[PDB]
């Protein structure tokens, strides 16, 4: 191997609070033609709650790159 | 008369699917229903049509449906042929098909059969079979009607095979000759339908506990193929035909031969035409359930103290343990397992893992749950092996290929898979579980087959501490003898103790005695061990949310559930990780599903937290509840600047509080004295300081 | 005699109904056959006594079953293909022969004809093969208890799942075998089985749920006569002797020494042993259940102190004992082991030392010297009397 | 596509979008992205063909969402073969 | 609303603090026992209701498939349970026994049940029409 991702769990009074807020909001966001429009676009609004690039863009991106 | 019998069947059946089979209109679907089925079928390529059996019963007072059921295999070609005379009229799919094949598959039968109910008397009949699949076989194309070509006339023969042996004409129907030379088979002008064979076995609910479950092999033809999946309970429906097996020799003996030719040896095999595999949806489950039972639920859900009425009624025999019984009641009521943004999917299930001192009735909970929780399994563990637990790889002679054995985990899907004596299970098998804990799915790459099967399975445990009983002297760290991960993945923990007392051990002994005194089975809890099942099968469908600002609350609370742990010096917790936070989410959701209420409110989070955190005088819980309510009351009066509060004012405050306490005035006089006892007790305690 | 018995049965049914106004309109009764179930004809001496002189007699056998072949159909009436002549013909067999008429159907539209058979609409009959391992009541040494394959015909079918402890009364049989199976030549030294006639169900009192059809009605007719049939011997001179002994005061002492008279003053051991023999009563709850109706006695002490010989003595006393050593045995030996038989793809159980002792005591020596890999199945069987096996092929729970 | 990839933030916007539901671990997400994109391999007939393909070992620790990361990877990448060390059976991992 | 049996408000808090009544509560309680007589019996009739709907299908459960005439009680019950009653609407064994007893009683014409030593064997089916008597709830 070349890269060794060393992760570690450490108790913290604060960083864990922010992390917890994040995880709770994650479990919150998890859970005709115009209904499908309003659904796809709302899934994309959730794709933007994690503000950077949406996913499908990124998988097309990695395909483009490795090609 | 049997010719015209099948023909009357034809007339009646064509007539049935001719007129309406569904009276509904303007609220459900249009009057004519199977005409609509045919129309749906014509545009697409369904290639088969499903029809209710109830409607068949409702066609000619069941007589038609009864006749179809009792003797069926004689009518399959008869009815399949009758179907054309209809479809030729309305949907001209058949001439445009260039093929003339339609699997008339029935479903929703009134009477499922356990597999040991299968006889030979039911031969050729129609029947539905519940069971659990195992070791599917790869789909193989199967000839249905072939084109035989004469050796010299070279004429086409639409010869039909019967899954018995190579059939063949006798005289070339081309009247040019009446030869008997072997007509040359053709594969092109030969419609062949692939079929998959699965080994079904009897489930646990119907087998008497202590007996080995019989099995059999069933065959899926038509579009029903591939619908099975190792572990999925199914309720197949179809014929009960027999297949010849030349491989039966010796021990039976007497078996006859076709001499006035060779011994026709046979073996039973269900042949299923339709498969069902299931096991905001209340829009479905409710109206599906008739208005009558809605009253029964309405009762068992509108009562105030159900969550208590339930928890003290999960272990009628066991004495107390109101901590663990809660832990179980929440087990059977899973989380939501809803996937995240398309990124990933997270688990939605709970894994309580008892660990107790000797004689703590920890195996009773299991050998109860596994007999009350649907589709469950009890394995002693140390007798079993890790390979058996997750999935097995084994070879089959059908195609000379390696395939999958469902195992405890896959055939325990959507049910609790309890286990005993983890500690005894050497790590070689402890390992094979982890993926069925958090990643929720097993993945296997052996003997060439790479696959991954999702096992949405609650688990459990009952291992004993290291030294059988564990030194109160020693700590808990070097006392459980299990590594960190499998110690974490358990989103509960119950180190059950066992200590001496009098006001306890007397009660316990009286209880066990009353049990062994069969006559004194006063053990009747409020809710039977049956209505609990239906109440669950309802509550399993709520998928509430954290919309209440408990969300914020929860965050803060998790903080202290980290702070209280002080491993070494700001060193990571043994017992709690962020997985425990996700667990708190699920426990909350599950308590909500219990109370049959969406949108978890902070009190739920509170209960989940305290349940997750564990490890004179009168009934202790009552006293502490009195304490909590009274202290909240006094704090509110403090904030509101209200003047004062007297003992009798507090007793009337409870008068207010517990009116659903009910009973009799005598009770009120008694409960009043109890309240005065408790308040003077707090006085004697140091909780609230008195004045004047 | 069975045939004439059924004849008489149907005929007395007819006389009864011509005396009793309405039942089956005198015909539905007469149409259906009638079979008789004679059981308990005198308990033969297990396997090793079975004489080639009694090839056709009514034997009684005891002992648990090992494996049950899945339900096997058997031809009874043929249903021959409706030819181009378009009138299918159905015919029975009445022997191992099956005759297909050369000519076609009612009209000789095809005198030369290839009549075929529709092996789906043809009737059938259930023939279940049940291997059997007799109880080790008398097996001297050296040989594992024997085995006598069984066949069952259409009514007692599936009255005996695996693991059960059934009793049977049936007729012996003897059939040759083939070696090459190509030529018609057979082999001497016939093989033998038992065509069962009646099956005393389980010789147990669990009564959790049923297993089969009407047969359970026979079980209910069977359980009520319990007293004489189960004691297999009772006389109020024997019962009088019994009550008299019960009246005696030194009983608890006396019977103690009366277990092992050769054993010296250490009486309390004898007392505990006696109490093991009468172990408990089956309190069966509808909720909970499996409360280990019996007890279990370790005993330890200074070497050469009669312990092992007391064990021998008890094992000889009880009518079901299974002696067994420690460290010369494995978990499989202690609790039967299952096998997915690939012959018929089924669940066979094998040689449970503990399962042989289903009911009645066991014995185990050098219990300490037992391996830690073993001495773990105990942790389950002793407190639940079940063994939950879960290996590559199969998961199950066999109660012992 | 180029219009986006010509920004200055792509090398970190990708990271912050590499993981859909993870908090922190930018460094580990960075290594994930790196071994996901892959590098240009280069055959070497001179001494020995050296592949330009990263190999990340993630020394995890209970609680840290590592298996969720690699599950995301299984979904996102093109030729993922998820296989756990339970059903290893070396004959299975490599060819046989 | 449509019978979505949620209770998102009743779990709010100890809001039950407005009524600062006197010992008048005993008054309410003085009537409580009274309704306890009806309530209990009411619950009882609920089964007279509940079981009712169940049997509305049972005379098409045994009927439409099982034409073996000598059927007993244990076998037929253990058939009823683990039948479609493993779907959304489960049921218990002795409850199935009650269903059978009720079917017989509401139709003693054909269904004749008489017990021998243990378990009440049931009659020989002759397939009447039913709802005409099911209206007798
Ligand atoms: N709290 C209790 N109340 C009533 N009976 C109990 C209780 N605890 C144990 N028992 C009885 O005592 C017996 C022993 O129970 P357990 O300790 O659960 O046995 P177990 O599950 O084999 O324990 P281990 O750890 O596997 S040896 C059971 O058969 C119970 O009937
Ligand atoms: N009180 C006694 N009554 C009868 N026989 C006795 C007594 N004390 C010793 N013996 C005899 O001494 C021998 C001891 O045999 P056992 O005690 O059964 O063997 P053992 O004690 O199991 O040996 P270990 O070391 O304990 S495995 C036998 O021949 C007994 O008959
Ligand atoms: N930043 C995070 N955001 C959300 N969840 C997180 C985060 N970090 C960790 N988790 C949790 O980590 C879980 C998955 O962690 P895993 O990588 O599976 O740990 P693990 O490696 O499986 O533990 P082992 O392998 O048994 S030592 C997720 O389900 C989350 O609950």
Swiss-Prot record, chain B:
Main localisation: nucleus
GO molecular-function term, one example from the UniProt record: single-stranded DNA helicase activity
Protein name: DNA replication licensing factor MCM6
Note: Present with 13400 molecules/cell in log phase SD medium. Early fractionation of eukaryotic MCM proteins yielded a variety of dimeric, trimeric and tetrameric complexes with unclear biological significance. Specifically a MCM467 subcomplex is shown to have in vitro helicase activity which is inhibited by the MCM2 subunit. The MCM2-7 hexamer is the proposed physiological active complex.
SMART domains listed in its UniProt record: MCM
Gene Ontology terms describing biological process: DNA replication; DNA replication initiation; DNA strand elongation involved in DNA replication; double-strand break repair via break-induced replication; mitotic DNA replication; pre-replicative complex assembly involved in nuclear cell cycle DNA replication; premeiotic DNA replication
Catalyses which reaction(s): ATP + H2O = ADP + phosphate + H(+)
Domain of life the protein comes from: Eukaryota
PANTHER family: DNA REPLICATION LICENSING FACTOR MCM FAMILY MEMBER, DNA REPLICATION LICENSING FACTOR MCM6
Oligomer and partners: Component of the MCM2-7 complex. The complex forms a toroidal hexameric ring with the proposed subunit order MCM2-MCM6-MCM4-MCM7-MCM3-MCM5; loaded onto DNA, forms a head-head double hexamer. Interacts with MCM10.
Phosphoserine sites (modified residues): 211
Family classification: Belongs to the MCM family.
UniProtKB/Swiss-Prot annotation, chain C:
Domain (MCM): residue spans on this chain: 251-400
Domain of life: Eukaryota
Note in the entry: Present with 8800 molecules/cell in log phase SD medium.
Function noted in UniProt: Acts as a component of the MCM2-7 complex (MCM complex) which is the putative replicative helicase essential for 'once per cell cycle' DNA replication initiation and elongation in eukaryotic cells. The active ATPase sites in the MCM2-7 ring are formed through the interaction surfaces of two neighboring subunits such that a critical structure of a conserved arginine finger motif is provided in trans relative to the ATP-binding site of the Walker A box of the adjacent subunit. The six ATPase active sites, however, are likely to contribute differentially to the complex helicase activity.
Family: Belongs to the MCM family.
Assembly: Component of the MCM2-7 complex. The complex forms a toroidal hexameric ring with the proposed subunit order MCM2-MCM6-MCM4-MCM7-MCM3-MCM5; loaded onto DNA, forms a head-head double hexamer.
UniProt protein name: DNA replication licensing factor MCM4
Gene it is expressed from: MCM4
Curated annotation (Swiss-Prot), chain D:
UniProt-annotated location(s): Nucleus
Residues noted as binding ATP in the record, renumbered to the chain: 60-67
Domain of life according to the entry: Eukaryota
Cystines in this chain: none
Transmembrane segments: none
Summary of the function given for this chain in its UniProt record: Acts as a component of the MCM2-7 complex (MCM complex) which is the putative replicative helicase essential for 'once per cell cycle' DNA replication initiation and elongation in eukaryotic cells. The active ATPase sites in the MCM2-7 ring are formed through the interaction surfaces of two neighboring subunits such that a critical structure of a conserved arginine finger motif is provided in trans relative to the ATP-binding site of the Walker A box of the adjacent subunit.
Additional remark text: Present with 1690 molecules/cell in log phase SD medium.
Self-association and partners: Component of the MCM2-7 complex. The complex forms a toroidal hexameric ring with the proposed subunit order MCM2-MCM6-MCM4-MCM7-MCM3-MCM5; loaded onto DNA, forms a head-head double hexamer.
Family the entry assigns: Belongs to the MCM family.
Protein name: DNA replication licensing factor MCM2
Organism from which the protein derives: Saccharomyces cerevisiae (strain ATCC 204508 / S288c)
Swiss-Prot record, chain E:
Top-rank taxon, per record: Eukaryota
Localization of this protein: Cytoplasm; Nucleus
Family membership: Belongs to the Cdt1 family.
Subunit structure: Associates with the MCM2-7 complex. Interacts with MCM2, ORC1, ORC2 and ORC6.
Misc. remarks from the entry: Present with 2190 molecules/cell in log phase SD medium.
Protein task: DNA replication licensing factor, required for pre-replication complex assembly. Faithful duplication of the genetic material requires 'once per cell cycle' DNA replication initiation and elongation. Central to this control is the tightly regulated formation of prereplicative complexes (preRCs) at future origins of DNA replication. Required for the recruitment of the MCM2-7 helicase complex to the replication origins.
Listed name of the protein: Cell division cycle protein CDT1
Native species: Saccharomyces cerevisiae (strain ATCC 204508 / S288c) (Baker's yeast)
Protein's gene: TAH11
First-to-last residue of the parent protein present: 459 to 595 of 604
């Amino acid at each position: 191997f070349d890269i060794l991702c060393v992760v570690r769990d450490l108790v913290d009074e604060e960083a864990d609070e922010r992390l917890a807020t994040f995880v709770v909001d994650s479990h919150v966001r998890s859970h005709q033609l115009n209904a499908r429009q309003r659904r796809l676009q709302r899934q994309r609004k959730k794709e933007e709650e994690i503000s950077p690039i949406p996913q499908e863009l990124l998988m097309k991106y990695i395909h483009y790159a490795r090609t | 008369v049997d010719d015209v019998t099948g023909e009357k069947v034809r007339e009646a059946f064509e007539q049935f699917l001719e007129d309406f089979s569904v009276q509904s209109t303007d609220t459900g679907e249009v009057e004519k229903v199977y005409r609509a089925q045919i129309e749906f079928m014509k545009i697409y390529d369904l290639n088969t049509i499903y029809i209710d059996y109830q409607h068949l019963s409702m066609r000619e007072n069941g007589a038609l449906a009864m006749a179809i059921s009792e003797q069926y295999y004689r009518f399959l070609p008869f009815l399949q042929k009758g179907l054309r005379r209809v479809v030729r009229k309305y949907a001209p799919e058949l001439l445009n098909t260039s093929e003339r094949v339609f699997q008339i598959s029935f479903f929703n039968l009134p009477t499922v059969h356990r597999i040991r109910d299968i006889r030979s008397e039911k031969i050729g009949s129609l029947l539905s079979i519940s069971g659990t699949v195992t070791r599917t076989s790869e789909v193989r194309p199967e000839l249905y009607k072939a084109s035989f070509t004469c050796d010299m006339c070279r004429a086409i023969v639409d010869n039909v095979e019967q899954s018995f042996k190579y059939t063949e004409p006798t005289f070339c129907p081309n009247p040019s000759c009446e030869n008997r030379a072997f007509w040359t088979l053709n594969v092109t002008r030969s419609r062949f339908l692939d079929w998959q064979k699965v080994r079904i076995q009897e489930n646990a609910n119907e087998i008497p506990t202590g007996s080995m479950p019989r099995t059999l092999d069933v065959i899926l033809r038509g579009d029903s193929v591939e619908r099975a999946k190792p572990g999925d309970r199914c309720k197949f429906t179809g014929v009960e035909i027999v297949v010849p097996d030349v491989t039966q020799l010796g021990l039976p003996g007497v078996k006859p031969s076709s001499t006035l030719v060779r011994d026709l040896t046979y073996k039973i095999s269900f042949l299923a035409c339709h498969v069902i595999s299931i096991g905001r949806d209340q829009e479905v489950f409710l109206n599906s359930l008739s208005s009558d039972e809605i009253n029964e639920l309405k009762e068992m859900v509108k009562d105030e103290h159900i969550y208590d009425k339930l928890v003290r009624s999960i272990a009628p025999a066991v004495f107390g343990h109101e901590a663990v019984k809660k832990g179980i009641l929440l087990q059977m009521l899973g989380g939501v397992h809803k996937s995240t943004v398309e990124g990933i999917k997270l688990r939605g299930d709970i894994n309580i893992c008892v660990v107790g001192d000797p004689s703590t009735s920890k195996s009773q909970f299991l050998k109860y749950v596994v007999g009350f929780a649907p589709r469950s399994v009890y394995t002693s563990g140390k007798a079993s092996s890790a390979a058996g637990l997750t999935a097995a790889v084994v070879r089959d002679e059908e195609g000379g290929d390696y395939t999958i054995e469902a195992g405890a985990l896959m055939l325990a899907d959507n049910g609790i898979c309890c286990i005993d004596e983890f500690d005894k299970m050497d790590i070689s098998d402890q390992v094979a579980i982890h993926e069925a804990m958090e990643q929720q799915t097993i993945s296997i790459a052996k003997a060439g087959i790479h696959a991954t099967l999702n096992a949405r399975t609650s688990i459990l445990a009952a291992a004993n501490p290291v030294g059988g009983r564990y030194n109160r002297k020693l700590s808990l760290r070097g006392n459980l003898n299990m590594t960190a991960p499998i110690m974490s993945r358990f989103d509960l923990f119950f180190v059950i103790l066992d200590d001496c007392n009098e006001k306890i051990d007397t009660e316990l002994a009286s209880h066990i005695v009353d049990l062994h005194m069969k006559r004194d089975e006063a053990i009747e809890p409020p809710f039977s061990a049956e209505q609990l099942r239906r109440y669950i099968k309802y509550a399993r469908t709520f998928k509430p949310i954290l919309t209440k600002e408990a969300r914020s609350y929860l965050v803060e609370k998790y903080k202290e559930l980290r702070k209280d742990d002080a491993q070494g010096f700001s060193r990571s917790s043994y017992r709690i990780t962020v997985r425990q936070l996700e667990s708190m989410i699920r426990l909350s959701e599950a308590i909500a599903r219990a109370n049959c209420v969406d949108e978890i409110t902070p009190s739920f989070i509170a209960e989940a937290y305290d349940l997750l955190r564990q490890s004179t005088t009168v009934t202790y819980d009552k006293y502490v509840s009195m304490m909590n309510m009274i202290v909240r009351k006094i704090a509110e009066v403090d904030r509101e600047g209200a003047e004062e509060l007297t003992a009798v004012d507090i007793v009337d405050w409870y008068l207010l509080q517990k009116e659903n306490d009910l009973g009799s005035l005598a009770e009120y006089w008694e409960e009043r004295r109890l309240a005065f006892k408790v308040i003077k007790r707090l006085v004697k305690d140091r909780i609230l300081m008195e004045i004047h | 005699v069975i045939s004439i018995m059924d004849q008489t049965i149907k005929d007395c049914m007819v006389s009864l109904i011509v005396d009793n106004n309405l039942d089956y309109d005198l015909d539905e009764i007469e149409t259906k056959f009638y079979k008789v179930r004679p059981y308990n004809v005198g308990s033969c001496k297990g396997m090793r006594e079975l004489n080639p002189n009694d090839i056709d007699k009514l034997i009684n056998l005891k002992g648990l079953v090992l494996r049950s072949t899945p339900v096997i159909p058997d031809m009874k009436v043929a249903f021959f293909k409706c030819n181009v002549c378009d009138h299918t013909m159905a015919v029975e067999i009445d022997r191992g022969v099956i005759q297909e008429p050369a000519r076609c159907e009612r009209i000789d539209c095809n005198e030369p004809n290839s009549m075929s058979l529709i092996h789906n609409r043809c009737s059938f009959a259930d023939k279940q093969v049940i291997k059997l391992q007799e109880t080790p009541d008398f097996v001297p040494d050296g040989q594992t208890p024997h085995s006598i394959s069984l066949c069952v015909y259409d009514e007692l079918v599936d009255s005996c799942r695996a693991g059960d402890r059934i009793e049977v009364t049936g007729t012996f049989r003897s059939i040759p075998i083939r070696a090459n199976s190509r030529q018609r030549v057979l082999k001497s030294l016939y093989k033998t089985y038992v065509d069962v006639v009646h099956v005393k169900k389980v010789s147990d009192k669990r009564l959790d749920v049923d297993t089969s059809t009407i047969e359970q009605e026979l079980m209910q007719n069977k359980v009520d006569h319990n007293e004489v049939e189960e004691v297999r011997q009772i006389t109020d001179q024997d019962l009088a002797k019994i009550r008299e002994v019960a009246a005696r005061e030194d009983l608890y002492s006396l019977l103690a020494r009366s277990i092992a008279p050769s054993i010296y003053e250490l009486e309390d051991v004898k007392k505990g042993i006696l109490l093991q023999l009468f172990g408990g009563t089956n309190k069966t709850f509808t909720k909970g259940g499996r409360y280990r109706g019996d007890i279990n006695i370790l005993l330890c002490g200074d070497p050469s102190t009669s312990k092992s010989q007391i064990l021998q003595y008890v094992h000889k006393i009880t009518p079901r004992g299974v002696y067994t050593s420690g460290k010369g045995s494995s978990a499989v030996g202690l609790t039967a082991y299952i096998t997915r038989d690939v012959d018929t793809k089924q669940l066979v159980l094998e040689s449970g030392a503990l399962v042989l002792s289903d009911g009645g005591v066991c014995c185990i020596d050098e219990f300490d010297k037992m391996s830690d890999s073993t001495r773990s199945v105990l942790h389950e069987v002793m407190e639940q009397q079940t063994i939950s096996i879960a290996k590559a092929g199969i998961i199950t729970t066999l109660n012992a | 596509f180029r219009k986006i990839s010509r920004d200055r933030g792509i090398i970190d916007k990708i990271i912050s979008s590499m993981a859909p539901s993870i908090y922190g671990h930018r460094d580990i997400k960075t290594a994930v992205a790196c071994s996901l994109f892959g590098g240009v391999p280069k055959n070497v007939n001179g001494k020995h063909s050296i592949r330009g393909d990263i190999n990340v070992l993630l020394l995890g620790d209970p609680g840290t969402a590592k298996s969720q990361i690699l599950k995301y990877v299984e979904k996102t990448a093109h030729r993922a073969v998820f296989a756990t060390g339970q059903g290893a059976s070396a004959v299975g991992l490599t060819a046989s | 609303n449509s019978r979505y049996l949620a209770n998102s408000k009743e779990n709010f808090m100890y809001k039950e603090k407005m009524p600062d009544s006197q010992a008048n509560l005993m008054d309410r309680l003085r009537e409580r026992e009274r309704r306890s007589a009806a309530l209990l019996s009411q619950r009882q009739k609920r089964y007279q209701q509940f079981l009712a709907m169940k049997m509305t299908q049972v005379f098409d459960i045994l009927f439409s498939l099982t034409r073996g005439q000598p059927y007993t009680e244990t076998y037929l019950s253990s058939l009823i349970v683990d039948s479609l009653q493993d779907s959304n609407n489960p049921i218990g064994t002795k409850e199935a026994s009650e269903i059978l007893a009720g079917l017989q009683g509401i139709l003693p014409m054909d269904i004749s049940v008489h017990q021998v030593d243990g378990g009440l064997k049931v009659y020989r089916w002759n397939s009447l029409d039913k709802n005409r008597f099911s209206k007798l709830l």
